[PDB]
Design a protein around this ligand. Sequence first.
Ligand SMILES: *[C@@H]1O[C@H](CO)[C@@H](O)[C@H](O)[C@H]1NC(C)=O
Lengths: 103, 126
Amino acid sequence: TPEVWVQVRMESFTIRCGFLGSGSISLVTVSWGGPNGAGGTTLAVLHPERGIRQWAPARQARWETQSSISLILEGSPSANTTFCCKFASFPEGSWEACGSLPP
Amino acid sequence: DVRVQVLPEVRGQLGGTVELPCHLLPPVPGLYISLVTWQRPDAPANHQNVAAFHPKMGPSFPSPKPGSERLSFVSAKQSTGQDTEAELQDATLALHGLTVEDEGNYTCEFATFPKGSVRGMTWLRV
Ligand SMILES: *[C@@H]1O[C@H](CO)[C@@H](O)[C@H](O)[C@H]1NC(C)=O
């Protein structure tokens, strides 16, 4: 089973997330407060060749590895705030996980 | 700017064949579809992804539960060369030999570049 991991830390604050799977990544999307495209507020879209799109809270976005990304956001996030990362990958499909700051 | 056109409910007959329509409806210049994924959110995790289509490499059906023997993409086209581009905007699924196991919610999701994840949801009944 593929696995998505999410780590949220205070630096402004940083969202890091990555995909542990058996295929390459076609797209990464990052959202605030709920699932990507299904309730959450979009923060960033990352494509391996076409680049990065980002929305206001997110100030910086980058690939940390070929399977993981990092976002810097201007804050404010609470311990209860959820951040979700969705990885679209062939052949396994789309996989998402959500995380929050350590209380 | 873009939305997924699906039917709210699809009704099928046991042993028969049905289609689940899914179109990213407004053709928008500069909008790229990098992947299409069909999921059954009600399923266990290892059975949730039931179909995927890649612009270059075509379809996969990683869950066995409907599985590749009874599921197919009706219209999605992979790119055939450096001349011709993939056509993923019609993600309609066909399901054959319908069984009670196939009933449930199905989500069709486009992984699009500028816009992000765009999805619609259908309920299939048998
Ligand atoms: C989350 O935490 C913030 C700060 O403590 C608070 O204002 C907000 O009401 C909380 N939200 C929920 C849904 O509990």
